[PDB]
Amino acid sequence: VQLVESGGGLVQPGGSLRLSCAASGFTFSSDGMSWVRQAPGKGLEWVSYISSGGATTYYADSVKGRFTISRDNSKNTLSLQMNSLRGEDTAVYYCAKDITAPGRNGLDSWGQGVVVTVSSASTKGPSVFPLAPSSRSTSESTAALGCLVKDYFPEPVTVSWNSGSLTSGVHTFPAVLQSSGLYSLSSVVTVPSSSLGTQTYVCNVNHKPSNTKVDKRV
Amino acid sequence: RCIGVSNRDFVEGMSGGTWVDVVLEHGGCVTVMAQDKPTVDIELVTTTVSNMAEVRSYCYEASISDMASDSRCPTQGEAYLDKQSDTQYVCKRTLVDRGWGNGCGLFGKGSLVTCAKFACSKKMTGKSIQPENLEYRIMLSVHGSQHSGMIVNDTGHETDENRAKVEITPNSPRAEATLGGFGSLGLDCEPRTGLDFSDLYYLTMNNKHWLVHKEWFHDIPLPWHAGADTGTPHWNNKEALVEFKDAHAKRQTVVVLGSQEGAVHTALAGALEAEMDGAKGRLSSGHLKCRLKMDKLRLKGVSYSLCTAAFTFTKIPAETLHGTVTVEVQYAGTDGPCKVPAQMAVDMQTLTPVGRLITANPVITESTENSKMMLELDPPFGDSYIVIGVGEKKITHHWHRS
Amino acid sequence: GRLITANPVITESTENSKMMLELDPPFGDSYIVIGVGEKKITHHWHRS
Amino acid sequence: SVLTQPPSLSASPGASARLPCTLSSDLNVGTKNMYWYQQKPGSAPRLFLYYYSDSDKQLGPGVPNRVSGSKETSSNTAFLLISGLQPEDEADYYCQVYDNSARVFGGGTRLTVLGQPKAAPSVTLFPPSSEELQANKATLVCLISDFYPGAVEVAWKADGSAVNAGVETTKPSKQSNNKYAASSYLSLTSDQWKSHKSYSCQVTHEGSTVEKTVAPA
């Protein structure tokens, strides 16, 4: 049994997408089907269900009036057309067998899912700022300094330190995705306190999609 | 305009500054009220795409004619018909069992080809939406002078500075409506709404019209031809609506599948709908983000004095869906044009105003004598009195909202 | 109309107690009015 | 209708793991079909267990006998049970129910088959720099690295009153030494930043809270 989804991608608030699921390995015309969502880092959420013959359709209230589910049993294809997309609809969409039996149900088999991204902004470069300690804990003279990379649109951002000179103690962290639609990222290095007055600390941020190369006096 | 509309949306304009953002929906109006400014009603009535180039046409009901078959014995090669390579004919070759019962010398698999002429009865057409080629149509109506007979009135709107019509297009997001003695109203809207018209087709089935995504339209399993017609279009995958069955050694039956109206209409369930007439009319969809400035929008009749004669209701105060109250009055004076004294008060003496007036700066225009004029108020929660006129021969009407 | 719950009364003094009462509104259109003067409570009604 | 699951649980192999799923008073656990779905990182959810009673159940395809289910009516709670735990069983687990066209999923329990001595989180909190304040904004970054099963809770504070605005925290993320890392961001203005005498990042992990403070002084 294989459930292969497609038809998703990057959309912007409003508008419409149409998701399609090709089914094989089983008698498609005899099973109910349902779509289920999973936002990045969040749990599962049922979207809509369609019966085997298509006579009965069900929708979650969070999608009612905006989504509509369709079936084509002769081609073994499941459809979910989504209108008036909002930021809440940003998630991975799974196609699943929603079976019906004598007193037993369930989402028997799942597809690998397709990504649907609703976002308003177009493309944006970052602004880099330092993160100085200003406090000295002096636990084996270990002081930690870094730089934050704020409000960039495309996820690829490569961060170096002292143009590759600084490799020991480097920690670049995964980014946030803010309600503004942009990403923010931070990188920190732990350094001996004996170097505060001798070693010049420099962070090297490169954001290729927008042609920004920012090196800040961390 | 805008009074009887269910989706009415009394959005308030910031008193003093000329900054107002408005969401404009299809089938819903917006009433913008400012300070020392004429309240104006704004509705997005029509959204049109104009540029329609035919992309691909599909046939959903067909006719068959001239069914024929040619059969061959085993070890005598391949079957052949003169129309098997014809563009308008659909064919199928198969291997049937042949032998002495079928009038053949040997027992083996004989070649059988059968064809028939395909004719399209009814067709649907998917055509192109050229992105950056939209056309929004907005109507604007001004309060105060107008009476409710103007609620539904679209004629004379150029001479009347009461109702302006505006068009907004991609590459021309700015616009400014002329309201004459009311001044002018500017508005800069076009959202570029992530509603990817560059990725949709306009599907016309038969007097039924829809807005359709491209990847689904390309994978429709029905006969098709790309462009428009110039005589005998060449259909492809004609097998989609015609099937051969049960070949018996000299003949194979072939039938058309029938109408695919319900199949595609069911497949289009939940799509963005549309219409067409006048050769260019189109969709019913809204979500128009606008930002409008009313700096050049002046009030008309501020220099008028108050009307002195008596009024009379020609309609009793009627509550709307949103708690506002509409009022129509006749005026028995020659004082016109003049300012109508309108107010609400729990007080009755003397003469504290409580609520708001939607029809800001109410006036009459006709002079002599018994002119009509209709007005809308927003009373406070609780009790209040509707007061039209001044002094003797006044008009008083009690009200209870909610 | 008519009141089923004759002499509606609150018993607990302070502060935000709850009470119940039943009415028999006339046929047609009506308003349920509890309270007096300012900060009254009104609700429109249309029975059958 | 609300199904409530603990955000994360943790145990060692050979243990009888117990993953609860409390049903809201809307439903009654004894009358419900229970569907558990297993999802491992990088994979789709798989039907793990159907359970109505000890006499009415069915394990998913390829799900070992060690998996079982149960119910308790007093607490209106369903349970997923794993005899003799093993590292392969480490995944996220979601309970699910049917109710009049609605398929309701629980929050999901992230089960950690214990592999490590439960590590102490290392926290550092940075104030707004100068260059960004002159751009009228002020963003405080709180960074968490090298901690035990990837589940922390961060609470932001300011002058004693918990703030719930301008906060965005990354999900936990496995890094080099198979430990987890995360970062929380607090976005304020320059006047918002000066308004309060003291801010604090308050991260709790397994019921023990680490708290770092920063001051505009």
From Swiss-Prot, chain C:
It is a multi-pass membrane protein. It is found in: Virion membrane; Host endoplasmic reticulum membrane. It comes from the Viruses. N-glycosylation plays a role in virulence in mammalian and mosquito hosts, but may have no effect on neurovirulence. The transmembrane domain contains an endoplasmic reticulum retention signal. Binds to host cell surface receptors and mediates fusion between viral and cellular membranes. Efficient virus attachment to cell is, at least in part, mediated by host HAVCR1 in a cell-type specific manner. In addition, host NCAM1 can also be used as entry receptor. Interaction with host HSPA5 plays an important role in the early stages of infection as well. Envelope protein is synthesized in the endoplasmic reticulum and forms a heterodimer with protein prM. Homodimer; in the endoplasmic reticulum and Golgi. Interacts with host TYRO3, AXL and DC-SIGN proteins. Interacts with non-structural protein 2A. Interacts with host HAVCR1; this interaction likely mediates virus attachment to host cell. Interacts with host NCAM1. Interacts with host HSPA5. Interacts with Aedes aegypti SRPN25, APY and venom allergen-1 salivary proteins; the interactions do not affect Zika virus replication in human endothelial cells and keratinocytes. This is Envelope protein E. It comes from Zika virus (isolate ZIKV/Human/French Polynesia/10087PF/2013). The chain holds residues 646 to 693 of 3423 of the full protein.
